[PDB]
């Protein structure tokens, strides 16, 4: 029905900490995945885009928190954390610590301290209709073979080939003087394809007489010896 895409950059050694049922320092006091997370942990390396030869004062980890965070919780407040018996109404003292800190991602650091962009695909599985569209999927294009075609409702079978006919750009189907679909339009490539009837005919068994012999020959009327010894 509706997928929620949440993107965030974390450290290079906490890729597996954000998992259903995991107690991590950045998985408990931050965005937490519950035991019913039916999404993915799709992530990649970003050591080229997010890297910068500077102090890297753009990312943080948000470790200092009073209590544990609920799953899918986004804390926007910037209040000063209080450890215990030390209220800081102004600036943070010795016991008071700020809830933010620069996440230094040096380009010389190896695997474990590199910036990794992690985005979870939280799939809301509420039993509800799939908004506006459900299937609406197409396959590839097989030609020069009698197969079943289902081009935008038109059902049947035949040898789909290529035709040198230029349809006007408002007509989709195509017929003849016998009310038979003889040409269709590819709904994907917007090309003109010729639909020809599947190769059929009549089998005729040539028999010189059972009294003479038993060797017989078959005749496939209307076949070019390609659709199935002398």
């Amino acid at each position, epitope marked *: 029905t509706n997928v929620y895409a949440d993107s965030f950059v974390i450290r290079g050694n906490e890729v597996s900490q954000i998992a259903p049922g995991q107690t991590g320092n950045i998985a408990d006091y931050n965005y937490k995945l*519950p035991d*019913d997370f*039916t999404g993915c942990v799709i992530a990649w390396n970003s050591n080229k885009l997010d890297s910068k030869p500077s102090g890297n004062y753009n990312y943080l980890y948000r470790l200092f928190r009073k209590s544990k965070l609920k*799953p*899918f919780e986004r804390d926007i407040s910037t209040e000063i954390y209080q450890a215990g018996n030390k209220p800081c109404n102004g600036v943070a003292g010795s016991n008071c610590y700020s809830p933010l800190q620069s996440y230094g991602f040096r380009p010389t650091y190896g695997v474990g301290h590199q910036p990794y962009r992690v985005v979870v695909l939280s799939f*809301e*599985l*509420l*039993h509800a209709p799939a908004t506006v569209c459900g299937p609406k999927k197409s396959t590839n294009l097989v030609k020069n073979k009698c197969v079943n075609f289902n081009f935008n409702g038109l059902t049947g079978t035949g040898v789909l080939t290529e035709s040198n006919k230029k349809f006007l750009p408002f007509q989709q189907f195509g017929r003849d003087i016998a009310d038979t679909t003889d040409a269709v339009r590819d709904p994907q490539t917007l090309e003109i394809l010729d639909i020809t009837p599947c190769s059929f005919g009549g089998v005729s068994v040539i028999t010189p007489g059972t009294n003479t012999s038993n060797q017989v020959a078959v005749l496939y009327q209307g076949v070019n010896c390609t659709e199935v010894s002398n």
Partner: antibody
């Protein structure tokens, strides 16, 4: 303080539809889900069902399955519940319950309303 | 759906002792269970959620535990404001079919 205000008493007739609202307050009506549960006199909670504050992505119960509609409204942050074709066994007190988790997950019901005595008789 | 059934259905004890009310199920609900408390004259309140941790605004006397298919509530000391009806609810992941039981009334032994 998060307090869910609901309606009071409301009478109807067999073969009609009752509109009962339950307005939210205290929290932003964009991240917390809500459930509409029925409490019968002497019995307990019977049917589940969640309404999405963002979109109309809802999930009705299996007992009704069609004869109930739950809309959403982000203007005044108020939910709605319209039960159709009320019978002699639907007379009970309806409640609106929130959840401790956000939109994706849902654990249990923590914040409840006050109730709405919906009865069907002259 | 998992028919949540309560065997005792009537817990008549005295204020001050310990109480143990059970609500068993069939499917593995070791991590999928919720406990409520409905007092007569108002709306039910959340007592213990997830059946493993403590809820907010709940005194220390309420202690819940259990795993597998047998769960029970371990109240430390009964109080006059604790006599109410408790329920149980499981949280299925995919099929949202949250059901309930019948309720256990807590009586006073005069």
């Amino acid at each position: 303080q998060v307090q869910l205000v609901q309606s009071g008493a409301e009478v109807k007739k067999p073969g009609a539809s009752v509109k009962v609202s339950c307005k939210t307050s205290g929290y932003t009506f964009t991240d917390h889900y809500m459930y509409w549960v029925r409490q019968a006199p002497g019995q307990g909670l019977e049917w589940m069902g969640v309404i999405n504050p963002d979109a109309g992505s809802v999930t009705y119960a299996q007992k009704f399955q069609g004869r109930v509609t739950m809309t959403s409204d982000t203007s005044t942050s108020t939910v709605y519940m319209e039960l159709s074709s009320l019978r002699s066994e639907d007379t009970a007190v309806y409640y609106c319950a929130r959840d401790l988790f956000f939109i994706p997950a849902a654990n249990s019901f923590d914040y409840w309303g006050q109730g709405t005595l919906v009865t069907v008789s002259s | 759906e998992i028919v949540l059934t309560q065997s005792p259905a009537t817990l008549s004890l005295s204020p001050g002792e310990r109480a143990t009310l059970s609500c068993r199920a069939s499917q593995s609900v070791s991590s999928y269970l919720a406990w409520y408390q409905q007092k007569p004259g108002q709306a039910p309140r959340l007592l213990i959620y997830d059946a493993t941790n403590r809820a907010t605004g709940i005194p220390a006397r309420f202690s819940g535990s259990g795993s597998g298919t047998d769960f029970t509530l371990t109240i430390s000391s009964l109080e006059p404001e604790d006599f109410a009806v408790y329920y149980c609810q499981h949280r299925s992941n995919w099929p949202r079919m949250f059901t309930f039981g019948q309720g256990t009334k807590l009586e006073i032994k005069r």
